[PDB]
Amino acid sequence: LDPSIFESLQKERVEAGDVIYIEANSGAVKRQGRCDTYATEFDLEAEEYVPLPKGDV
Amino acid sequence: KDPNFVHSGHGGAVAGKKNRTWKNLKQILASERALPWQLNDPNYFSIDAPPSFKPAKKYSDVSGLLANYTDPQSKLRFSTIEEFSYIRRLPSDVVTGYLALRKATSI
Amino acid sequence: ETEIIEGEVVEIQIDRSKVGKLTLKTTEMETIYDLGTKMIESLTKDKVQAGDVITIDKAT
Amino acid sequence: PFRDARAAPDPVLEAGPVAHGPLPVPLVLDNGSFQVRAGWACPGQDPGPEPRLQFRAVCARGRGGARGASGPQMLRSPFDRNVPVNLELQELLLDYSFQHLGVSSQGCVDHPIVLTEAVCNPLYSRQMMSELLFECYGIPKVAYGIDSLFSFYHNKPKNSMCSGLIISSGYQCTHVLPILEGRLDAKNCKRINLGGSQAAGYLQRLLQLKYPGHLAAITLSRMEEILHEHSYIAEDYVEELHKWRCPDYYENNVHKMQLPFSVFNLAAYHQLFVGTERIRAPEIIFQPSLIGEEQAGIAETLQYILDRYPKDIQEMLVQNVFLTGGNTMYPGMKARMEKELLEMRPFRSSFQVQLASNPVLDAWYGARDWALNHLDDNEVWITRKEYEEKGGEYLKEHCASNIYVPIRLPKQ
Numbered sequence: 001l002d003p004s005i006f007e008s009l010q011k012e013r014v015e016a017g018d019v020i021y022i023e024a025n026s027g028a029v030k031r032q033g034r035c036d037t038y039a040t041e042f043d044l045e046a047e048e049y050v051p052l053p054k055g056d057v
Numbered sequence: 058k059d060p061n062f063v064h065s066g067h068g069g070a071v072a073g074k075k076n077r078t079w080k081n082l083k084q085i086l087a088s089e090r091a092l093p094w095q096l097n098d099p100n101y102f103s104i105d106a107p108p109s110f111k112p113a114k115k116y117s118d119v120s121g122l123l124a125n126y127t128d129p130q131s132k133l134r135f136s137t138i139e140e141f142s143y144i145r146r147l148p149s150d151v152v153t154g155y156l157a158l159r160k161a162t163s164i
Numbered sequence: 165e166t167e168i169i170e171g172e173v174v175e176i177q178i179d180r181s182k183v184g185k186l187t188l189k190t191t192e193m194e195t196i197y198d199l200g201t202k203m204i205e206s207l208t209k210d211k212v213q214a215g216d217v218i219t220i221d222k223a224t
Numbered sequence: 225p226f227r228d229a230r231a232a233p234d235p236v237l238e239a240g241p242v243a244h245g246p247l248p249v250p251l252v253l254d255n256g257s258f259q260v261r262a263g264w265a266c267p268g269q270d271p272g273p274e275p276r277l278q279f280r281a282v283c284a285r286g287r288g289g290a291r292g293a294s295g296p297q298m299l300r301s302p303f304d305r306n307v308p309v310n311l312e313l314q315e316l317l318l319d320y321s322f323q324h325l326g327v328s329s330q331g332c333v334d335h336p337i338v339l340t341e342a343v344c345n346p347l348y349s350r351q352m353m354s355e356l357l358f359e360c361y362g363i364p365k366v367a368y369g370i371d372s373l374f375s376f377y378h379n380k381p382k383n384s385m386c387s388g389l390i391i392s393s394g395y396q397c398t399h400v401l402p403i404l405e406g407r408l409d410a411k412n413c414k415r416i417n418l419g420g421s422q423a424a425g426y427l428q429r430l431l432q433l434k435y436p437g438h439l440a441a442i443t444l445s446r447m448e449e450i451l452h453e454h455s456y457i458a459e460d461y462v463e464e465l466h467k468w469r470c471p472d473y474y475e476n477n478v479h480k481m482q483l484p485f486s487v488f489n490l491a492a493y494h495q496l497f498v499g500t501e502r503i504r505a506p507e508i509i510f511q512p513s514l515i516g517e518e519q520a521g522i523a524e525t526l527q528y529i530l531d532r533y534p535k536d537i538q539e540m541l542v543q544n545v546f547l548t549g550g551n552t553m554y555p556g557m558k559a560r561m562e563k564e565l566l567e568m569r570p571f572r573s574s575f576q577v578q579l580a581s582n583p584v585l586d587a588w589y590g591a592r593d594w595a596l597n598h599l600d601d602n603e604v605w606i607t608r609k610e611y612e613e614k615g616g617e618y619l620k621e622h623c624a625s626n627i628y629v630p631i632r633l634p635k636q
C-alpha cells in the first residue's frame with residue numbers, strides 16, 4: 001500500500017483481524033466488521049462480527 | 058530354552074526406600090536439563106507445540122452446542138432456555154463433574 | 165436482521181484500560197457477561213443501575 | 225449394540241523360521257504404547273505375510289502379588305507419554321513376544337532387531353532401552369527408528385530421497401514432522417500432548433455425567449467401540465454442531481447404542497444416545513481447548529512451523545502432507561485437513577494430502593521393508609561391541625531415525 005491508502009485504513013479505524021474491502025483503482029477502503037474467529041475476545045463488546053469471506057482474495 | 062535367567066540389576070528399589078521401578082518421566086527430564094546442550098540441538102523438552110494465539114470458542118457443557126450464555130451461580134455455560142431449565146435441576150456432583158472437564162476453578 | 169439484548173440488569177461491576185462485568189435476567193434465564201472497553205464506556209456514560217430494564221443494540 | 229473383544233490367541237512356532245540365504249533373519253518390533261506389533265522379517269516375500277502378535281501393551285498383577293501376565297486377556301503398562309520407563313514390565317512384554325515367536329535356545333536371542341522409539345527419545349531412556357536389551361537378551365546388533373517415518377518410507381512413490389510433513393497421532397501424542405532431503409528437521413519439529421487415549425477418556429467422562437444411574441455399564445472397552453465405529457471428524461466444527469442443533473436432523477443422525485438388558489428397561493439398560501458427543505471426542509486434537517489444555521492444536525501448529533521457512537521450500541515440503549498412525553483412522557480426516565490447509569496457503573498455490581495405505585500397520589510394514597533391505601549395511605546398525613565403548617546413549621543417523629548429537633551420560 002501507499003501512504004494515502006494507509007491514511008484511509010487508519011481513518012476507518014482498521015486493525016488486525018478486521019475484514020476489509022480494498023478497491024485498488026479508486027483507492028476506496030471499507031471496513032466490514034471484525035472476523036468472527038475473534039468473536040470470543042469478550043462476551044459483550046460493541047463490534048459487529050462477520051464470518052471469514054468464502055470468495056477469492 | 059529361555060533367553061536368560063541371570064538378569065542384571067539395572068536400577069530397581071532393592072537398595073533403599075526410593076520409588077519402586079524407576080524414576081518417573083518428569084524426574085528423568087529434570088536430570089536431562091543438567092547436560093551441556095547447545096542452541097541448535099534437538100531435545101525431548103523443547104519439541105512442545107506453542108500455546109494458541111486466538112481466544113477460545115465457548116461451547117455449552119451439557120450438549121456441546123455454541124453457548125451465548127453462562128449461569129452466574131453454577132458457572133456452567135448453555136445455549137437455550139430448555140438447557141437453562143435442565144442445568145438448574147442437576148445435583149452439585151455432576152455440576153463440579155462438568156467443570157472438571159475444562160480445568161476450571163473447580164478443584 | 166439485528167442482534168439485540170433485552171433484560172433486567174441484576175449486577176454491574178467496574179475497575180481502576182478497564183475491565184468490568186454484568187449480570188442480566190429474564191423471567192426464564194440468567195447470564196453473566198465480561199465487558200469489552202467500548203461497552204464499559206457506554207454503560208458508564210448512561211449510569212445504568214441494578215433493577216433497570218434495558219435493551220442493547222449489540223452491533224452499535 | 226455393543227460387542228466384546230477377543231483374547232488369548234494361539235501363536236506358537238518352531239525355534240526359528242530361517243529362510244534361504246542369510247541365516248540371521250531379524251525381528252521387526254513396533255514397540256507401541258497402545259499395543260505392540262512384532263514378527264520375523266520373512267525375506268523374499270513381497271506382501272508381509274504374517275504380522276503376528278497384535279496385542280495390547282498392558283500387563284496384569286493384582287492383590288495376589290506372586291504372579292504376573294502379559295498377553296491379551298487392576299492393570300499396568302510400561303510407558304509414560306509414549307516413552308518406555310519401566311524395568312521388568314518391559315522385560316515380561318518382550319518375553320511374551322519372543323516366546324510366542326520361538327527362539328533358538330542358548331543364553332541369548334541370536335537374531336538382530338529393529339525397534340521403534342519416541343520421535344525424540346531422552347538420552348537416559350535410550351541408554352536404558354539399550355542396556356535392558358544387550359545385557360539381558362544378548363542381541364548381536366540393533367536398530368532404532370521412528371514409527372511414523374517407517375510408515376512414510378513404506379508409502380513413498382519410490383525408494384528415493386524426499387521431503388514432506390508427517391502428521392502422526394498415536395495413543396498419547398500427535399506430532400508434526402517436517403522432513404527435508406530424507407532427514408528429519410528435528411530442530412523445528414513439534415508435538416501436541418494429546419491423542420486417542422484422551423479422546424476416549426473425555427467421551428467416558430461425558431457419558432458418566434449424562435447417565436449417573438449406571439456409571440458401571442460404561443467402560444473403556446465400550447468407549448473404544450463408539451470411538452472406532454461411530455465417531456467422525458467435522459469439516460468445520462462450528463457448522464457441524466450448528467446443523468446438529470435442529471431436532472429433525474438430530475433424530476435422523478443420533479446413534480442408538482443399546483446396552484445388554486437383564487418401563488421399557490432403558491431407565492437402566494439405556495440406548496445411550498450419542499449425538500454431539502460423536503463429534504466432540506474426535507475434535508480434541510484440533511481444539512485441545514475442549515479439555516482444559518492450552519496448546520495450539522494440529523491446525524495452528526502446522527502454520528506455526530510452516531511459516532519458519534523460506535517461501536520456496538514451504539511450497540516444496542507441502543507437496544507431500546502425509547497422514548499416519550492411530551487417530552488418522554477417523555472418517556473425514558483427509559477432507560478436514562485439506563480444507564484447513566486451503567486457508568493457510570497463497571491464493572492460487574498447490575498442495576497434496578496423502579493418507580497412509582494402512583494407518584496402524586504401516587509403521588511395522590515400514591520397519592520390515594527397511595530391515596529386509598539394509599541387512600549388511602554395517603554402518604547403519606549398532607553392533608553388540610559398540611555398546612561396550614559407547615554407553616548406550618548412541619545412534620547411527622540412518623534415514624527414518626531420530627537426530628543424533630555428540631553427548632555422554634555419567635554412570636558408575
Ligand SMILES: Nc1ncnc2c1ncn2[C@@H]1O[C@H](COP(=O)(O)OP(=O)(O)O)[C@@H](O)[C@H]1O
Nearest residue numbers: 256257258259394395420421452549550551553
Ligand atoms: N479404527 C480406529 N478408529 C479410530 N481410532 C482408532 C482406530 N484404531 C485405533 N485407534 C486409536 O489409535 C490409538 C493407538 O494408535 P497406535 O499407532 O497404536 O499408537 P502408538 O504408536 O503410540 O502406540 C488409540 O488411541 C486408538 O483409540
